[PDB]
Design a protein around this ligand. Structure first.
Ligand code: MG
Ligand code: MG
Lengths: 87, 91
DNA sequence: ATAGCGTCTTAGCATG
DNA sequence: TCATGCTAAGACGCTA
């Protein structure tokens, strides 16, 4: 139960990159976060809301053509480096 | 890249250009978009930096009338003027 | 979606 | 040389 130094942008990024189809709906993004980080079981209930806000307004996440989310090809490398610059 | 005006200068020029010297945050977006077309297709984070500058800077006071109106604190105004006449351009 | 305030990094300058 | 502090600035994120 560590504290993840990554933002919710990097947690969503790693969950989608670990999927077989490189895409996930908002449900499995929750389940991937709880598994690899049991920290969010003791966190306040609003943690699921903050990842939807990031999923919706971040330039790095788009929907494919309960829909499915994926990584945007333009700002993809912005996320790989955002995970190398995390404190 | 970014226009040569700082976010504090962009907010100051938008409020002073209004008849009541008071604006909500949505109207500040509309003034900057029409006077600077770069932000129409810019990354969406620029609106976040606008609201961040309003809450952080002491020279921007919150006033009441759904958000709230924003104005320029009078006792911090001519300090902001001299800072903007000393460095009028900041890319 | 919006509005308020936040975290993080960077930079020049500055003091120990 | 170094560390530490100050100040403004902004890209980007969180919460209600
Ligand atoms: Mg999005
Ligand atoms: Mg203020």
């Amino acid at each position: 139960n560590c504290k993840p130094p990554y933002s919710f942008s990097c947690l969503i990024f790693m969950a989608i990159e670990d999927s077989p189809t490189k895409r996930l709906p908002v449900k499995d993004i929750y389940n991937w976060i709880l598994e690899h980080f049991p920290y969010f079981a003791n966190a306040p209930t609003g943690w699921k809301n903050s990842v939807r806000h990031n999923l919706s307004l971040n330039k790095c996440f788009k929907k494919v053509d309960g829909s499915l989310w994926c990584i945007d090809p333009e700002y993809r490398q912005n996320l790989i480096q955002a995970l190398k610059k995390t404190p």
